[PDB]
Design a protein around this ligand. Structure first.
Ligand SMILES: CCCCCCCCCCCCCCCCCC(=O)OC[C@H](CO[C@@H]1O[C@H](CO[C@H]2O[C@H](CO)[C@H](O)[C@H](O)[C@H]2O)[C@H](O)[C@H](O)[C@H]1O)OC(=O)CCCCCCCCCCCCCCCCC
Ligand code: CLA
Ligand code: CLA
Ligand code: CLA
Ligand code: CLA
Ligand code: CLA
Ligand SMILES: CCCCCCCCCCCCCCCCCC(=O)OC[C@H](CO[C@@H]1O[C@H](CO)[C@H](O)[C@H](O)[C@H]1O)OC(=O)CCCCCCCCCCCCCCCCC
Ligand SMILES: CCCCCCCCCCCCCCCCCC(=O)OC[C@H](CO[C@@H]1O[C@H](CO)[C@H](O)[C@H](O)[C@H]1O)OC(=O)CCCCCCCCCCCCCCCCC
Ligand SMILES: CCCCCCCCCCCCCCCCCC(=O)OC[C@H](CO)OC(=O)CCCCCCCCCCCCCCCCC
Ligand SMILES: CC1=C(/C=C/C(C)=C/C=CC(/C)=C/C=C/C=C(C)/C=C/C=C(C)/C=C/C2=C(C)CCCC2(C)C)C(C)(C)CCC1
Ligand SMILES: CC1=C(/C=C/C(C)=C\C=CC(/C)=C/C=C/C=C(C)/C=C/C=C(C)/C=C/C2=C(C)CCCC2(C)C)C(C)(C)CCC1
Ligand code: OEX
Ligand SMILES: [Cl-]
Ligand SMILES: [Cl-]
Lengths: 449, 243, 35, 61, 36, 336, 37, 32, 76, 44
């Protein structure tokens, strides 16, 4: 590597020394990709080595095996696991690919060419060559669209994906007739992010999921071809900054938005994150608790539509602000929760009284009781329950872990976007190192501020 | 054009710049033949005369294996898709008409026609045809014939013609008069032929392993990739789950 | 009360449009520095 | 058929350790990559062959 | 007099400190104070 | 040539000649904020009682309904609404819009937009003045704290009623109930936040005492030392070497800041990163990650429970938990 | 659990999560070795 | 236990690999 | 002047600290592993927290006879 | 029904638009701001 005097960047900003070095940039990137696939494979092997079959995966502290099981590998009806060999194969393949990527990144970092422009014109680039940056972006867009279409092919012809909305408690379903209608697909995008709408977190069926994936894959492929065969327009060239730190800041803002959004999926969505693998959500656990105590007091010979609470609002069933029949108590705030075990009990006017009385199911009751016992309430010592609870239960929801970690990473990366966008603007401007001391802009304009 | 990557001292090699510097490339591979990648892990190239004598067999193998790969993958695919082939599988095609049950030839787009020829007659005319063909190849003499390129060529057209690349009667569509396009099409031909030999070897070993044709292999692999591959067919039958 | 929603939507869209097209209005040329 | 798979996997682990220790050493050595070509290529080839051998022997065990 | 490198001394000291802290964190899940 | 209306408006907006810089971030910062202040003053003065818990038990919160300044607070939204969006047009009448806590959502949304565009405007003025732009990066920590306590915690708990009430006694109620729920005192992120504000006070006193102690004598004892400093001067006003030497022989020589740039960077970075950590702690508690749980950890050889200070903290958490929202729980487990 | 053929390799499986932390700490070690130039 | 012993040996071999390569590069020429 | 760059890089320093620091570590280990810490600091062992006469937390409930009463309420 | 409501909660309304007049004023305001920006070009 280089030093402080030859580059002007200190060791704690050493990667800035490889801003203009394309070969070392590529080496750092490939070594980092090797690190990411290494974590994927190593965590997969660790989780399958620490996997217990007679327990649900949300009690065992796993986050990658639920991801693989959602795609429908080694799982059967009801969310039960049938084989861990697909997870083991995925982990081993990721470890080998990580070895390959790490070798490539290390080779380019150490003895790879320093600059690719004078010897490899296809891979050479300067940060102001907007055409070449759009070509690289187009290639990556083709790769992303191919990956989305690969997921689509997996859910269509390659065993399908796990449907938690299947009758009986969910099963590995083959997707038939994906909803490719632009209106319903993009109504998620132009939706409000508040309660009752939830923006794209409230996607409730694999048909819309696969339709949106088909749409995003086709859009990404056409956008990649467009970027390969076009150049940024003059309005975009006037509006944007064309430095490497600027491009990094744009990517940082984007991935911060994705981190916050994925935190919201992990906390609220139970379709792309099935509850049989990730545990119940907050609303799901509260509604499961209310429904379990509902059926308990119904078995104990107590009227459920009547028999109001101490506030006269309803102990078991009452009215939502819109007017639907919802579960009583503080779980009113979770009246928009939709799960596989409430929908058969829900009619046109919300929770039907006759359906809740006679159309009950033992599997629904068992799932609700298990979700009530396993709410996403825990300490960072992995102590189940609220903060007052005794150190006796070793469980914290994977949904809670994913949401906390991803919101943290999204916020740090938003601040990183702030830092890099400001430094990119100041570096393109010319005063990123300070004030010129002979051309102070404040003294060039009049007093009184 | 664009011959600066398949010819000369700076060209595409079988290993990139970091793996293979140009110093340890063998001195008899100077980028004057088509498809020269400097690939010599073992000492078989010897000198220029030896490498061109082996390039003769390489080009013959390439041009034979291209037709071999196409004639393996086409009729099996047609039979699987619904044609009346009765023997589209390549490793059992010969055994069909052993006792006189002669094959059906499918001359698309208007095929399905019986061939009323027994095996002895077919092999006799094949020997007396291709022996004469290979005698014409190794001697460079032809009696007389008509080609779309040169019309009614006499016997004095094969003398002086380039070995392994005889222009004229074998080039009716031409597109080889320009030396630059001729050289890049030469490297195209040798690369396609190398891919074809690799494909034919893959066909043979795949057939030996799984007992079915390559078209059946590719169709079943696209039907179920993880559920049908080399590791699946080498497992024998199912697998005890690790639950 | 629909009129209130229409008015609020108009005001929000007006201010957001000024923001967006002001930043499209060649913002880096408002640089007090060199370049 | 399981013991030979375990032996091949242990050899693969040893070859991987030798690679991750020596490949940065070979690369960052002053004029060491020029002469360590054969040993590094042999190590990588043995690593790939052992990966393929463990993969093909997994189906038989 | 400068025989052993300072970076190697710091690496050894940091390794011992990290391992000792890992020992303390392991002791929170076993023995006394582990609710078991 | 700058004659067209949009060019003139753009030059006026990006003008650094104004008393307060507006900018393209200010064109959102100003109207959203003035909306928030207007409705906040009006609600704090004459807001009718708000049914916060959703149990038809309203909370006054406003001065004209019998609240003083400490007890006065804009009450959060009704629990029946939860995370639903409740603007005035989504209500049939202003009476029920005020009864259900709509002003709280309007203030919270406008305040979040206002602080975000204030941070953007800080960057914009740093850009238009030729300055380094990381003042907004420093200001990202109180913005993170406000977002965590006004939006992120209501998102994690599923109801805007769960946010921090806009007041003082409401703030204390939020903190007390929050301790009951999550045991925030026993959390590392909150511990780093407390260490950050304590160290921020310590370092503010340290830096101010070092600079004010080391000012160069340019006045007498009958006039204020501030009169010794002339604005716009280039001559230094204090002895950096004397201050650094005093600090070095006070605490440690080789562990002292001899460079003012590094010293001021440390002063900037310490409370900012600690407030980042505590805001992220609140946001992780929103998804119920909670603090350290050491209830019944020390056990003797016979298995009897040996109570500790964490067990006394558990007793405090129980006392808060059995009393918070005393009529809003029909069931034991507090999962909402 | 792991497959029966790969059961003895579980102890070397368990160490594999901490390698990226060891990698960033190795970057710090290398920077100490170059005397933080 | 055998599992604990193998875990400790694997952990020590991995955690020493970084210092091993850096010391070997520092004493074997340079370029680090 | 010994600016800590010579003492921490000298084998003369490190030959005597290779025994004194481990000796102190072993002394600290044995001090609590031999019960001497419980002896001198009065900390109760896990098996002696509760006696037969009392099965709850002890209470000092006195000032001028606190020595004798804590001797009576201790684990002998 | 004792009183009149818009009843716009939930349902996934595009930009929260319940009447076409709302989307039309969105389009009109954005279009007139864009038109002013487009006419006032070729400056500085
Ligand atoms: C305009 C943008 C406004 C953003 C802030 C407003 C609050 C948005 C919100 O209420 O957020 C939550 C929403 C999701 O909302 C929830 O969405 C849910 C969807 O699940 C529904 O659908 C599911 C389908 O499986 C299930 O059926 C489930 O049971 C069912 O309830 C429900 O509708 C809930 O009622 C609803 O509250 O997240 C989302 O829309 C994803 C969007 C990302 C949100 C990012 C939050 C952090 C934002 C800024 C932090 C800044 C930090 C830096 C500065 C400081
Ligand atoms: C993929 C995103 C990304 C990328 C590619 C970069 C890239 C770069 N950054 Mg940057 N940054 C990012 C995100 C990113 N950053 C984020 C999210 C933040 C937080 C706000 C920062 C804050 C930041 C600052 C302040 C600076 C850079 C700088 C730099 C440049 C030199 C980096 C270097 O060598 O420092 C060396 C790296 C280190 C010394 C490691 C830091 C130690 C970290 C903080 C330890 C944390 C680990 C901990 C276990 C994680 C858990 C925390 C939490 C997730 C729970 C470089 C081009 C420098 C620059 O501007 O150069 C021009 C610089 O000044 N970055
Ligand atoms: C994601 C982590 C990461 C990655 C991938 C990189 C990558 C890189 N850094 Mg960097 N760095 C990092 C983190 C990282 N850094 C952090 C956190 C800091 C703050 C302390 C720094 C500070 C820093 C500085 C100051 C500099 C770099 C530089 C470099 C570049 C060249 C280094 C070099 O060749 O010198 C030689 C390095 C060595 C000889 C150390 C050998 C260690 C080996 C490679 C470890 C490999 C082990 C692995 C298991 C091998 C497996 C391979 C195969 C068998 C699978 C390189 C592309 C230099 C640069 O900018 O280039 C101009 C430079 O000046 N970095
Ligand atoms: C970010 C990806 C990337 C990019 C842009 C490059 C770019 C480059 N590499 Mg490189 N490389 C990479 C990754 C990458 N590499 C990886 C992962 C490895 C480990 C195997 C290597 C190992 C490597 C070596 C050892 C060398 C190069 C060399 C080169 C340079 C020219 C020769 C060449 O193209 O080699 C061609 C590389 C191959 C033929 C490897 C096969 C790649 C095929 C095409 C895979 C198909 C991609 C497909 C989408 C699968 C991707 C998997 C994905 C899911 C992650 C060039 C600038 C050479 C050099 O440095 O010049 C002196 C050189 O010697 N690379
Ligand atoms: C993540 C992938 C990606 C990335 C990084 C880019 C990046 C870029 N694209 Mg591009 N594009 C992509 C995917 C991508 N595109 C895809 C998938 C398509 C196919 C649909 C296109 C089609 C496309 C076209 C036709 C054009 C670009 C253009 C551009 C350049 C300027 C865009 C701009 O001004 O900023 C952002 C743009 C805006 C802020 C104004 C657009 C208004 C919004 C963003 C459009 C969507 C409205 C909708 C209601 C928003 C709902 C979502 C929202 C609520 C979150 C820029 C470098 C332009 C260009 O310069 O040509 C090369 C151009 O004309 N792209
Ligand atoms: C290595 C070269 C090669 C060889 C040895 C064969 C051999 C064979 N082919 Mg085949 N084929 C080849 C290349 C080859 N082919 C190529 C390159 C193609 C793609 C154009 C085909 C497409 C093809 C089809 C569609 C069919 C065969 C069939 C056959 C079998 C009977 C042929 C016949 O009935 O009369 C010989 C053909 C003729 C007399 C007409 C050609 C006359 C020209 C002018 C010379 C036979 C074993 C048939 C079969 O039975 O399936 C197994 C069949 O239907 N081939
Ligand atoms: C900062 C960091 C960002 C972090 C996280 C960002 C989170 C989410 C990102 C956006 C997700 C939602 C996108 C669509 C929004 C939407 O459709 O709103 C639609 C909602 C509709 O809101 C309600 O919708 C209901 C039906 O769904 C009803 O109809 C109600 O009457 C209606 O009010 O409008 C909004 O609430 C806000 C939209 C306007 C936002 C104004 C501020 C914009 C500021 C800057 C813009 C810069 C460019
Ligand atoms: C640079 C470009 C800048 C600005 C460009 C802005 C707008 C471009 C023109 C948009 C014209 C379509 C929106 C208005 C419209 O007619 O649809 C308005 C409709 C409104 O929605 C529909 O309206 C019907 C009556 O027209 C019904 O009453 C219902 O409200 C509903 O079905 O579409 C929408 O849903 C709004 C979102 C459109 C995107
Ligand atoms: C809810 C309803 C709203 C939904 C809107 C969703 C559809 C549009 C969303 C994606 C639009 C892509 C914006 C890229 C160009 C933005 C910057 C620009 O402008 O680029 C600027 C560039 C400068 O050369 O120009 C150009 O490239 C020309 C690009 C702009 C061309 C579009 C203009 C549409 C015409 C509308 C005008 C109606 C005008 C008069 C209204 C008066 C009402 C009283
Ligand atoms: C798969 C899936 C799906 C689908 C999805 C999609 C399809 C999405 C998308 C989307 C889209 C399509 C989007 C768009 C976008 C854009 C953006 C997000 C942007 C941006 C940016 C910015 C912020 C800008 C700014 C600015 C301005 C405004 C001014 C000037 C300057 C600038 C330019 C910078 C669904 C849900 C169905 C289902 C499930 C799954
Ligand atoms: C350059 C640089 C660097 C580095 C970086 C990186 C990032 C690297 C890497 C790398 C990598 C990324 C690597 C990876 C790897 C992998 C491997 C090496 C592997 C393997 C294999 C094996 C051998 C396995 C085995 C097995 C199986 C198969 C299953 C079961 C289990 C077991 C384990 C047995 C640093 C920062 C230091 C410094 C600066 C510069
Ligand atoms: O609202 Mn406010 O505080 Ca969240 O936990 Mn559940 O809900 Mn109520 O209780 Mn606890
Ligand atoms: Cl409740
Ligand atoms: Cl309360």
């Amino acid at each position: 590597g280089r030093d402080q005097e030859t580059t002007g960047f200190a060791w704690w900003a050493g990667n800035a020394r490889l801003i203009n070095l394309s070969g070392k940039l590529l080496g750092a990137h490939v070594a980092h990709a090797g690190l990411i696939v290494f974590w994927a494979g190593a965590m997969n092997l660790f989780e399958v080595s620490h996997f217990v079959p007679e327990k649900p995966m949300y009690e065992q502290g796993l986050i990658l095996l639920p991801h693989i099981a959602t795609l429908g590998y080694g799982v059967g009806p009801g969310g039960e696991v049938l084989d861990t060999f697909p997870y083991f194969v995925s982990g081993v393949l990721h470890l080998i690919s990580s070895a390959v990527l790490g070798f490539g990144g290390v080779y380019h970092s150490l003895i790879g060419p320093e600059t690719l422009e004078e010897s490899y014109p296809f891979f050479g680039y300067v940060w102001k060559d907007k055409n070449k940056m759009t070509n690289i972006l187009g290639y990556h867009l083709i790769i992303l669209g191919c990956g989305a279409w690969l997921l689509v092919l997996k859910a269509l012809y390659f065993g399908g994906v796990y449907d938690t909305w299947a009758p009986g408690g969910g099963d590995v379903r083959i997707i038939s007739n994906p909803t490719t209608n632009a209106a319903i697909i993009f109504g998620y995008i132009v939706k409000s992010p508040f309660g009752g709408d939830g923006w794209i977190v409230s996607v409730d069926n694999l048909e819309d999921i696969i339709g949106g994936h088909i749409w995003i894959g086709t859009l990404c492929i056409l956008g990649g071809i467009w970027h390969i065969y076009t150049t940024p327009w003059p309005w975009a060239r006037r509006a944007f900054v064309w430095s490497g730190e600027a491009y990094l800041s744009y990517s940082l803002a984007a991935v911060s938005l994705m981190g916050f959004t994925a935190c919201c999926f992990a906390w609220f969505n139970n379709t792309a994150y099935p509850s049989e693998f990730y545990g119940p959500t907050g609303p799901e656990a509260s509604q499961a608790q209310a429904f379990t105590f509902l059926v308990r007091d119904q078995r104990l010979g107590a009227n459920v539509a009547s028999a109001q609470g101490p506030t006269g609002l309803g102990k078991y069933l009452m009215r939502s602000p819109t007017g639907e029949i919802i579960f009583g108590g503080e779980t009113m705030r979770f009246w928009d929760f939709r799960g596989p075990w409430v929908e058969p009990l829900r009619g046109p006017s919300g929770l039907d009284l006759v359906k809740l009385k006679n159309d009950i199911q033992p599997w629904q009751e068992r799932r609700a009781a298990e979700y009530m016992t396993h709410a996403p309430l825990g300490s960072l010592n992995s102590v189940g329950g609220v903060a007052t609870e005794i150190n006796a239960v070793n469980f914290v929801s994977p949904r809670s872990w994913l949401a906390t970690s991803h919101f943290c990473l999204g916020f740090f990366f938003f601040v990183g976007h702030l830092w890099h966008a400001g430094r990119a603007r100041a570096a393109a401007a010319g005063f990123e190192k300070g004030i010129d001391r002979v051309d102070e802009p404040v003294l060039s304009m009049r007093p009184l501020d | 054009p664009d011959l600066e990557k398949w010819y000369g001292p700076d060209r595409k090699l079988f290993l990139p710049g970091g793996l293979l510097d140009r110093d340890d490339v063998p001195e008899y591979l100077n980028g004057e033949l088509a498809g020269d990648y400097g690939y010599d892990p073992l000492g078989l190239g010897k000198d220029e005369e030896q490498v061109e004598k082996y390039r003769a067999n390489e080009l013959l193998h390439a041009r034979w294996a291209m037709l071999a790969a196409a004639g393996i993958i086409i009729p099996e695919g047609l039979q699987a898709n619904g044609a009346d082939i009765k023997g589209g599988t390549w490793f059992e095609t010969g055994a069909e008409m052993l006792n006189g049950g002669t094959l059906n030839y499918f001359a698309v787009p208007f095929g399905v026609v019986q061939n009323p020829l027994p095996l002895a007659a077919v092999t006799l005319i094949e020997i007396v045809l291709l022996g004469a063909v290979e005698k014409f190849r190794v001697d460079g003499t032809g009696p007389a014939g008509f080609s779309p390129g040169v019309g009614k060529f006499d016997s004095d057209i094969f003398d002086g013609l380039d070995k392994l690349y005889p222009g004229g009667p074998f080039d009716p569509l031409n597109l080889a008069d320009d030396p630059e396009v001729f050289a890049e099409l030469q490297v195209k031909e040798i690369k396609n032929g190398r891919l074809a030999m690799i494909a034919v070897l893959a066909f043979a070993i795949q057939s030996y392993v799984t007992g079915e044709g390559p078209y059946a292999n590719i169709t079943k692999h696209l039907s179920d990739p993880f559920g049908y591959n080399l590791l699946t067919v080498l497992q024998g039958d199912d697998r005890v789950p690790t639950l | 009360m629909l009129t209130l929603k229409i008015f609020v939507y108009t005001v929000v869209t007006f201010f957001v449009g000024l923001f967006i097209f002001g930043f499209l209005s060649n913002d880096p040329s408002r640089n007090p520095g060199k370049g | 058929m399981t013991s030979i798979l375990q032996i091949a996997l242990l050899g693969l682990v040893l070859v991987s350790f030798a690679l991750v220790v020596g490949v940065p050493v070979v690369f960052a050595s002053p004029n060491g990559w020029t002469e360590n070509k054969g040993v590094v290529f042999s190590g990588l080839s043995v690593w790939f062959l052992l990966v393929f051998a463990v993969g093909v022997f997994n189906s038989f065990a | 007099i400068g025989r052993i490198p300072l970076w190697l001394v710091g690496t050894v000291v940091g390794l011992l400190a990290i391992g000792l802290l890992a020992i303390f964190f392991y002791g929170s899940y076993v023995g006394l104070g582990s609710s078991l | 040539e700058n004659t067209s209306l949009w060019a003139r408006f753009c030059e006026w907006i990006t003008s650094t000649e104004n008393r307060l810089y507006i900018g393209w971030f200010g064109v959102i910062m100003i109207p959203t904020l003035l909306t928030a202040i207007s409705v906040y003053i009006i609600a704090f003065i004459a807001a009718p009682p708000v049914d916060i818990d959703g149990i038809r038990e309203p909370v006054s919160g406003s001065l004209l309904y019998g609240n003083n300044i400490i007890t006065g607070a804009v009450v959060p939204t009704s629990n029946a609404i939860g995370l639903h969006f409740y603007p005035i047009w989504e209500a049939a009448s202003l009476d029920e819009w005020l009864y259900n806590g709509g002003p709280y959502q309007l203030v919270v949304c406008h305040f979040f937009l206002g602080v975000c565009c204030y941070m953007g405007r800080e960057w914009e003025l740093s850009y238009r003045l030729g300055m380094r732009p990381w003042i907004a990066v420093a200001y990202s920590a109180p913005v993170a704290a406000a977002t965590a306590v006004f939006i992120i915690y209501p998102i994690g708990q599923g109801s805007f009623s769960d946010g921090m009430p806009l007041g003082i006694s409401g703030t204390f109620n939020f903190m007390i109930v929050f301790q009951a729920e999550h045991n925030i005192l026993m959390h590392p992120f909150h511990m780093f936040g407390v260490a950050g504000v304590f160290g921020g006070s310590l370092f503010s006193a340290m830096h101010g005492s070092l600079v004010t102690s080391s000012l160069i004598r340019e006045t007498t004892e009958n006039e204020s030392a501030n009169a010794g400093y002339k604005f716009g001067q280039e001559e230094e006003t204090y002895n950096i070497v004397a201050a650094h030497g005093y600090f070095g022989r006070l605490i440690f020589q080789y562990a002292s800041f001899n460079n003012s740039r590094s010293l001021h960077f440390f002063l900037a970075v310490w409370p900012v990163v600690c407030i980042w950590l505590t805001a992220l702690g609140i946001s992780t508690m929103a998804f119920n990650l909670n603090g350290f749980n050491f209830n019944q950890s020390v056990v003797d050889s016979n298995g009897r429970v040996l109570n500790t200070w964490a067990d006394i903290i558990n007793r405090a958490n129980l006392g808060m938990e059995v009393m918070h929202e005393r009529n809003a729980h029909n069931f034991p487990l507090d999962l909402a | 659990k792991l497959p029966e053929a790969y059961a003895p390799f579980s102890p070397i499986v368990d160490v594999l999560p901490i390698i990226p932390v060891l990698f960033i700490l190795l970057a710090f070690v290398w920077q100490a070795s170059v005397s933080f130039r | 236990s055998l599992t604990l012993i193998l875990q400790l040996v694997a952990l020590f071999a991995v955690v020493a690999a970084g210092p091993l390569v850096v010391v070997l590069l520092s004493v074997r020429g340079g370029n680090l | 002047e010994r600016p800590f760059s010579d003492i921490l890089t000298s084998i003369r320093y490190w030959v005597i600290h290779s025994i004194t620091v481990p000796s102190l570590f072993i002394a600290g280990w044995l001090f609590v592993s031999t019960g001497l810490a419980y002896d001198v600091f009065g900390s109760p062992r896990p098996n002696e927290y509760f006696t037969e006469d009392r099965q709850d937390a002890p209470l000092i409930t006195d000032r001028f006879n606190a020595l004798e009463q804590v001797k009576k309420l201790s684990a002998q | 029904l004792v009183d009149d409501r818009m009843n716009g909660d939930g349902t996934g309304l595009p930009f929260g638009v319940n009447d076409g007049i709302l989307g039309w004023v969105i389009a009109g305001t954005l279009g007139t701001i864009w038109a002013i920006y487009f006419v006032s070009q070729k400056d500085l």
